Design a protein around this ligand. Structure first.
Ligand SMILES: CC[C@H](C)[C@H](NC(C)=O)C(=O)NCC#CBr
Ligand SMILES: [Cl-]
Length: 130
């Protein structure tokens, strides 16, 4: 229905706004673009599901997210990819892990404050109905 398409449009507007707020944060600059194989050719071999905020914006616009839970699965991948690829005790790896966890925690905190639970439940019920 048009009412359902309106619902998903509102979801996309909400997700673009959350994703913009993460992308303009200076801590999260490393997560705004895909890893360049040039610098990191072993990346694509270790990390099977690369994810970054530019890929998230592309997916919103392709209507790949029908619920905030599907979006958060991709935010969680940005974090878990960084924890897996950069596990060492040296400061460069610890800084990327801290920034990755901070990205994830910031996205969850914005959604806890600003997502209406009944809106998410409506999205889930339309998605399950398809
Ligand atoms: C691509 C692997 C790399 C070792 C790591 N990045 C990620 C996303 O894991 C990192 O240390 N980034 C440095 C910079 C910049 Br912009
Ligand atoms: Cl830096």
């Amino acid at each position: 229905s048009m009412q359902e398409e309106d619902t998903f449009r509102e979801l996309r507007i909400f997700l673009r706004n959350v994703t913009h707020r993460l992308a303009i944060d200076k801590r999260f600059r490393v997560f705004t673009k895909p890893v360049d194989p040039d610098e990191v050719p072993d990346y694509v071999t270790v990390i099977k599901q690369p994810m970054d905020l530019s890929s998230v914006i592309s997916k919103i616009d392709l209507h790949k997210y029908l619920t905030v839970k599907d979006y958060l699965r991709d935010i969680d991948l940005i974090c878990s990819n960084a924890l897996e690829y950069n596990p060492d005790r040296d400061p460069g790896d610890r800084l990327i892990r801290h920034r990755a966890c901070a990205l994830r925690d910031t996205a969850y905190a914005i959604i806890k404050e600003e997502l209406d639970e009944d809106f998410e439940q409506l999205c889930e019920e339309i998605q399950e109905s398809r």
